[PDB]
C-alpha cells in the first residue's frame, strides 16, 4: 500500500525500489504578450528517479521539443513521465529491475500503472511522505545539465556522492532530505551554508562538498536552524 512513517525502514531493505518525482518535468515561465495577454514559455525539465538504498539517480532530461504542438501539457507531462520510467525499467537487466516504484505525487499512479501493464509484479505505490525532491534543480550540477541539454538525454548520478562508504542508506537519505528541504525553503541561505568555506570544495565527480564527518554534523545543524528560522518567519512564531 502507501509508503508512510510506519513502513519507513522498507526504503533501505534489499528489495530494489525507485522513487519517481515528476515535479520538474514540465517547467514554464509565465509572461505577458505584446497584446497584454498571458503566455507560457517552457524550459527544459527532468524526471527524478532515485534508488534510495544505493543513491543511484536516473535523471531523464525532458527537452522542450517534447511539448511542441501538444495540448494539455500538465496532463501530458504525467504520461510522458510514465512512458520514460517504463522505458527505463525495460532497459535494465531483469535482476536490476525494481520490485516497487513509489510515486511522490498520487496523480502519477494511473499513468504509471497503465505504462507498466507488461510488469504486473512491479508494485506502483503512492506515499504519504512529503518529500523535497522538487528542489533537485537547486543542486547546481543537476540544474546545469538540464539547462544545457539540446535534445533528450539520460544522465546518471549517485546523489549520495561517496557517503555510503561511511554512513548507512538510512542516514544518507535523511541527510539528502534535510539538504533538499533546506534548499526548497531558502535556496540562497542553504547554498551559502554549503559553499561559504572556500577550503571545502566539490569534487569533479560529486554533487555536494567534501565535508568531514564532523563538518557534516555542523552543516546539518545549520540546515535545521535554517528550516526552523524560516518557519518562524512564515508563521510569525
Amino acid at each position: 500500500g502507501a509508503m508512510n512513517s510506519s513502513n519507513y525502514a522498507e526504503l533501505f531493505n534489499n528489495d530494489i525500489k525507485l522513487f519517481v518525482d515528476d515535479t520538474n518535468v514540465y517547467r514554464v515561465t509565465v509572461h505577458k504578450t505584446f497584446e497584454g495577454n498571458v503566455a507560457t514559455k517552457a524550459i527544459n525539465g527532468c524526471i527524478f528517479t532515485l534508488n534510495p538504498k544505493t543513491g543511484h539517480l536516473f535523471l531523464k532530461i525532458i527537452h522542450t521539443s517534447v511539448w511542441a504542438g501538444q495540448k494539455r501539457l500538465s496532463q501530458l507531462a504525467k504520461w510522458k513521465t510514465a512512458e520514460e520510467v517504463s522505458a527505463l525499467v525495460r532497459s535494465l537487466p531483469k535482476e536490476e529491475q525494481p520490485k516497487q516504484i513509489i510515486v511522490t505525487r498520487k496523480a502519477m499512479l494511473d499513468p504509471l500503472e497503465v505504462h507498466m501493464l507488461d510488469f504486473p509484479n512491479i508494485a506502483i505505490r503512492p506515499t504519504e511522505l512529503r518529500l523535497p525532491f522538487s528542489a533537485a534543480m537547486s543542486i547546481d550540477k543537476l540544474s546545469d545539465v538540464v539547462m544545457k541539454a539540446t535534445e533528450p538525454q539520460m544522465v546518471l548520478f549517485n546523489i549520495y556522492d561517496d557517503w555510503l562508504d561511511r554512513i548507512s542508506s538510512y542516514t544518507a537519505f535523511s541527510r539528502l532530505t534535510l539538504l533538499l528541504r533546506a534548499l526548497k525553503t531558502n535556496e540562497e541561505s542553504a547554498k551559502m551554508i554549503l559553499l561559504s568555506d572556500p577550503t571545502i570544495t566539490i569534487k569533479s565527480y560529486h554533487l555536494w562538498p567534501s565535508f568531514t564527518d564532523e563538518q557534516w554534523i555542523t552543516i546539518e545543524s545549520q540546515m535545521r536552524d535554517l528550516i526552523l528560522t524560516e518557519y518562524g518567519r512564515k508563521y510569525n512564531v
Binding site: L76, W79, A82, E83, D110, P111, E113, V114, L117, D118
Partner: protein, 300 residues
C-alpha cells in the same frame, strides 16, 4: 399467452414476475401465473417470508418449452422444471384456470415497460452468461458471483459476464497508453463491439440483463457489470449515433423502473456523475439526465 403453473405453495413467499410482485401465504391455494406475454424473456423470482436471504429466480421464455414451479422441501426452494408431456401440461393448466387458482400477468395495454427493459435481451445469450445447458431456463440468485469477481469460487455457479477492465492490456494498445486510457473508443468499438459482442444489440442485451439481475436479486456483481458497460460507452469519444440514442432510452427506462428506496445501493455515484457531467457523452443522454436529476438529485 402462456402459463407457468405451480404445483403448490407450501411456504410463505413473495413471488415476482418481471416488474410485478405478489405475496403468497403458507399453503395458500396458489397454482401459478397465466396470460404471460409472448415475445419476451421473463423472470419469475422469489423471496422467502421466513428468510429474506437469497432472493432467487428463473429466466425463461415460454416459446422454448412448458415450464412449471414446484417446491422442493429438501433443498428448500421453489424450482422451475420443464414438462415434456404436452397434453399432461395442458390438462393441468386448464384445470387450474377453470378453478381460478392463478394470477394474471397484470400488463396494461399502454405499458411498454417490460419490452423497454428487455428489448435486446435474448434467452440464448442469457444461457451463455448462466451456464447450465441441461435446462432451457436459467437460475440466478442474490449471491452468485461474476467471473470478474472470482478472479480478484465455484465456477459452475458463476455469472459469465464479459470482463471489462480499464487498466488491462485488453483495454490499452501499446504505444497508445494515454490515448486509450483517456478515450476508450478503441476498447469499445474494436475490442468489445467488433470483437467480442459482434454488434451493439448483444452489448445492450448484456447491459440490460445485468441491470435486471441487480434490481431483482440485489446481485452486486451484476450491478458492477451494468455500471462498467455504461461507463465504457460514456468514456468513449467516438460512439455510433444510433448507440448513443438507444443507450439514452435504455437507461431512461431502467432509472424509471428502479424502486425509489433502492437508489442508495443500486446506483454508483462516481459512475453516474462522471457519465452525466464529465464524460465525452455528458450531453448525449438528455432523457436519462432529466429523469436522474428529477428523481435522484441527491446522488448527484
Amino acid at each position: 399467452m402462456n402459463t407457468v403453473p405451480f404445483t403448490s405453495a407450501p411456504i410463505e413467499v413473495t413471488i415476482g414476475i418481471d416488474q410485478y410482485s405478489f405475496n403468497v401465504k403458507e399453503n395458500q391455494p396458489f397454482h401459478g401465473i397465466k396470460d404471460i406475454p409472448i415475445g419476451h424473456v421473463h423472470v419469475i423470482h422469489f423471496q422467502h417470508a421466513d428468510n429474506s436471504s437469497m432472493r432467487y429466480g428463473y429466466w425463461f421464455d415460454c416459446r422454448m418449452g412448458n415450464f412449471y414451479i414446484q417446491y422442493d422441501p429438501k433443498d428448500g426452494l421453489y424450482k422451475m422444471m420443464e414438462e415434456r408431456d404436452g397434453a399432461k401440461f395442458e390438462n393441468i393448466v386448464h384445470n387450474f384456470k377453470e378453478r381460478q387458482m392463478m394470477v394474471s400477468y397484470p400488463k396494461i395495454d399502454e405499458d411498454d415497460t417490460w419490452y423497454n427493459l428487455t428489448e435486446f435481451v435474448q434467452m440464448d445469450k442469457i444461457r451463455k452468461i448462466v451456464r447450465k445447458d441441461e435446462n432451457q431456463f436459467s437460475y440466478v440468485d442474490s449471491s452468485m458471483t461474476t467471473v470478474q469477481e472470482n478472479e480478484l469460487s465455484d465456477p459452475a455457479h458463476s455469472l459469465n459476464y464479459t470482463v471489462i477492465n480499464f487498466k488491462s492490456r485488453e483495454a490499452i494498445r501499446p504505444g497508445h497508453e494515454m490515448e486509450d486510457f483517456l478515450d476508450k473508443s478503441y476498447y469499445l468499438n474494436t475490442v468489445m463491439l467488433q470483437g467480442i459482442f459482434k454488434n451493439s444489440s448483444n452489448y445492450f442485451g448484456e447491459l440490460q440483463f445485468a441491470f435486471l439481475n441487480a434490481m431483482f436479486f440485489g446481485n452486486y456483481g451484476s450491478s458492477l457489470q451494468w455500471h462498467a458497460m455504461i461507463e465504457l460507452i460514456c468514456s468513449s469519444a467516438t460512439v455510433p449515433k444510433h448507440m448513443l440514442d438507444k443507450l439514452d432510452e435504455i437507461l431512461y427506462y431502467q432509472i424509471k423502473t428502479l424502486p425509489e428506496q433502492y437508489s442508495d445501493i443500486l446506483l454508483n455515484e462516481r459512475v453516474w456523475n462522471i457519465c452525466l457531467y464529465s464524460s465525452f457523452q455528458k450531453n448525449s443522454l438528455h432523457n436519462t439526465e432529466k429523469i436522474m436529476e428529477n428523481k435522484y438529485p441527491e446522488l448527484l
